[PDB]
Write a protein that holds these residues in place. Structure first.
Motif, mmCIF file in Angstrom:
data_model
loop_
_atom_site.group_PDB
_atom_site.id
_atom_site.type_symbol
_atom_site.label_atom_id
_atom_site.label_comp_id
_atom_site.label_asym_id
_atom_site.label_seq_id
_atom_site.Cartn_x
_atom_site.Cartn_y
_atom_site.Cartn_z
ATOM 1 N N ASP A 1 0.802 -1.217 0.000
ATOM 2 C CA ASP A 1 0.000 0.000 0.000
ATOM 3 C C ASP A 1 0.838 1.271 0.000
ATOM 4 O O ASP A 1 0.273 2.368 0.007
ATOM 5 C CB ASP A 1 -0.962 0.009 1.197
ATOM 6 N N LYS A 2 2.160 1.158 -0.009
ATOM 7 C CA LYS A 2 3.018 2.328 -0.064
ATOM 8 C C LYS A 2 3.480 2.559 -1.501
ATOM 9 O O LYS A 2 3.146 1.807 -2.420
ATOM 10 C CB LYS A 2 4.195 2.166 0.898
ATOM 11 N N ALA B 1 6.003 0.227 9.723
ATOM 12 C CA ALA B 1 5.833 1.115 10.864
ATOM 13 C C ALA B 1 6.729 0.660 12.011
ATOM 14 O O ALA B 1 7.083 -0.516 12.121
ATOM 15 C CB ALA B 1 4.369 1.151 11.303
ATOM 16 N N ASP C 1 6.454 -0.005 15.041
ATOM 17 C CA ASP C 1 6.020 -0.842 16.156
ATOM 18 C C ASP C 1 6.506 -2.279 16.037
ATOM 19 O O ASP C 1 6.601 -2.971 17.057
ATOM 20 C CB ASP C 1 4.492 -0.822 16.282
ATOM 21 N N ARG C 2 6.808 -2.750 14.827
ATOM 22 C CA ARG C 2 7.307 -4.110 14.665
ATOM 23 C C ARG C 2 8.790 -4.240 14.971
ATOM 24 O O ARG C 2 9.257 -5.354 15.235
ATOM 25 C CB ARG C 2 7.061 -4.612 13.240
ATOM 26 N N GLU D 1 2.559 8.574 10.073
ATOM 27 C CA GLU D 1 1.233 8.250 9.555
ATOM 28 C C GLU D 1 0.211 8.261 10.681
ATOM 29 O O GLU D 1 0.441 7.673 11.743
ATOM 30 C CB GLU D 1 1.209 6.879 8.878
ATOM 31 N N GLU E 1 -8.463 -5.205 10.074
ATOM 32 C CA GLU E 1 -7.211 -4.868 10.743
ATOM 33 C C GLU E 1 -7.498 -3.941 11.915
ATOM 34 O O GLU E 1 -8.081 -2.862 11.714
ATOM 35 C CB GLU E 1 -6.216 -4.219 9.769
ATOM 36 N N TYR F 1 -5.899 -1.821 13.462
ATOM 37 C CA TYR F 1 -5.360 -0.473 13.298
ATOM 38 C C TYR F 1 -6.455 0.548 13.001
ATOM 39 O O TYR F 1 -6.413 1.677 13.502
ATOM 40 C CB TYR F 1 -4.332 -0.493 12.172
#
Ligand SMILES: OC[C@H]1O[C@H](O[C@H]2[C@H](O)[C@@H](O)[C@@H](O)O[C@@H]2CO)[C@H](O)[C@@H](O)[C@@H]1O
Length: 460
Positions: A14-15, A63, A65-66, A111, A153, A155
């Protein structure tokens, strides 16, 4: 092995991976070093598996967080940007990619989800979540609908769950408390209840995923959606005049998105660590490099100071930052994976009617906070490592359906991998109960089961 002399880069589908490859082709032009940009599915799960055996890409994007889980597992190289380069990015973006005192990724962009609305269908977008059902009834009378966003998801549903007080991990005295989880408190329940009520009143459908929601908004079929900056590009290509604004409030409190910092990490097994640093620092994190990616899919509010000064003039970016300042930067601690899986299960089960809201969040709470390493340690050292190879392959054959074990997996997976998969499917004490149940009637393991029964009471 990773091929020396080139760069393989993984980024989510999606980027702007085509704009990223344009920066890679400039790198190839200037250096002779071929850059290959790939966007495999489930890359945030695929990387830890391939990188745990020295394979995978040279550079991974995700992102922030991973990354703490990747660093704790030793899958990343410590990046060392010079003092002059660190001054080029905002200090708080460096904070997002710091773990155990070490920088573990380059921060690229901030984001945050925003409310996106069709200005022709809805010139005055709702301020509250509460007024959306009434908007949907009026809009259904024209054959439209009020709101569709990704319900697969967590998120995207988190901003509403956190609004009235839900949270992931408590931040206490400079550190995240992995035992203090707030996903089944009163606010988290109230937010999820509203979401399930939106579905029960047929204002939303539990099956909506990212593709369905994006196609619905970009074809003018729904008045609002919930998405981030990467999604703006496809709306620009469509015939929808859209706005980007503050997420609706719930019970008078703002929606609180989890804010992510898109970051690039360097595989610890990459033989091209210096080339990776050169590409990221002097081709990507430039006004020219970020512009190539942003023009493909908007990055959000970039970490690079000089280029964000230009992007901060965009109202869509002012909206992104306004929503972000009502949420929080995600933790990068390794427990974030277990949190996301637990919340995903809760939202899906509650939205489908499988579990009540109270049931779903109670299970998510205990799963997110569980002492996973403690039970894996018992399962491996006191269970799998005490049975012979013949009994291990028998147990794997009993677990084939439960763990999704192909024939090849049953032949090649070792006790450490089986332990990891087992505790993830049978969380906490349940994985000891499953092995006891499986090895119950094996007369050779009567001693093994005997201790597991005691060591499960001993741990309790
Ligand atoms: O929903 C769980 C998921 O949330 C976040 O993933 C985001 C990602 O940050 C965005 O850039 C975009 O790709 O949407 C994703 C959600 O589908 C977390 O970053 C991720 O760890 C987590 O699994």
């Amino acid at each position: 092995k990773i091929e020396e002399g080139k760069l393989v880069i993984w980024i989510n589908g999606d980027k702007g991976y085509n704009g990223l490859a344009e920066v890679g082709k400039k790198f190839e032009k200037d250096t002779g070093i071929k850059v290959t940009v790939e966007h495999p599915d489930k890359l945030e799960e695929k990387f830890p598996q391939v990188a745990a055996t020295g394979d995978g890409p040279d550079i991974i994007f995700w992102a922030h967080d991973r990354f703490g889980g990747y660093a704790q597992s030793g899958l990343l190289a410590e990046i060392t940007p010079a003092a002059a380069f660190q001054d080029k990015l905002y200090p708080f973006t460096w904070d997002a990619v710091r773990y155990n005192g070490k920088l573990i990724a380059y921060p690229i962009a901030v984001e945050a989800l925003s409310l996106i609305y069709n200005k022709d269908l809805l010139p005055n977008p709702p301020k509250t979540w509460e007024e959306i059902p009434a908007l949907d009834k009026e809009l259904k009378a024209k054959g439209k609908s009020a709101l569709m966003f990704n319900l697969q998801e967590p998120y995207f549903t988190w901003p509403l769950i956190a609004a009235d007080g839900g949270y992931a991990f408590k931040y206490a005295a400079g550190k995240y408390d992995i035992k203090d989880v707030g996903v089944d408190n009163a606010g988290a329940k109230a937010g999820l209840t509203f979401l399930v009520d939106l579905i029960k009143n047929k204002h939303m459908n539990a099956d909506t995923d990212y593709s369905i929601a994006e196609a619905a908004f970009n074809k003018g079929e729904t008045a609002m959606t919930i998405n981030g900056p990467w999604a703006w590009s496809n709306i620009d290509t469509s015939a929808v005049n859209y706005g980007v604004t503050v997420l609706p409030t719930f019970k008078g409190q703002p929606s609180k998105p989890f804010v992510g910092v898109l970051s690039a990490g360097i595989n610890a097994a990459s033989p091209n660590k210096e080339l990776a640093k050169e590409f990221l620092e002097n081709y990507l994190l430039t006004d020219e490099g970020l512009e190539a990616v942003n023009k493909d899919k908007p990055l959000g509010a970039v970490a690079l100071k000089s280029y964000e000064e230009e992007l901060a003039k965009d109202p869509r970016i002012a909206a992104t930052m306004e929503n972000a300042q009502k949420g929080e930067i995600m933790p990068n601690i390794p427990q974030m994976s277990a949190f996301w899986y637990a919340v995903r299960t809760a939202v899906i089960n509650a939205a489908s009617g499988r579990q009540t809201v109270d049931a779903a969040l109670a299970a998510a709470q205990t799963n997110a906070a569980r002492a996973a390493a403690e039970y894996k340690k018992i399962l491996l050292l006191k269970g799998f490592e005490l049975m012979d190879d013949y009994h291990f392959t028998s147990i794997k054959s009993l677990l084939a359906y439960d763990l999704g074990l192909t024939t090849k997996m049953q032949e090649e997976y070792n006790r450490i991998k089986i332990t990891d998969l087992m505790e993830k499917k049978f969380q906490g004490v349940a994985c000891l109960d499953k092995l006891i149940e499986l090895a119950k009637d094996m007369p050779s393991l009567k001693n093994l089961v005997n201790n597991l029964r005691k060591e499960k009471s001993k741990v309790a």
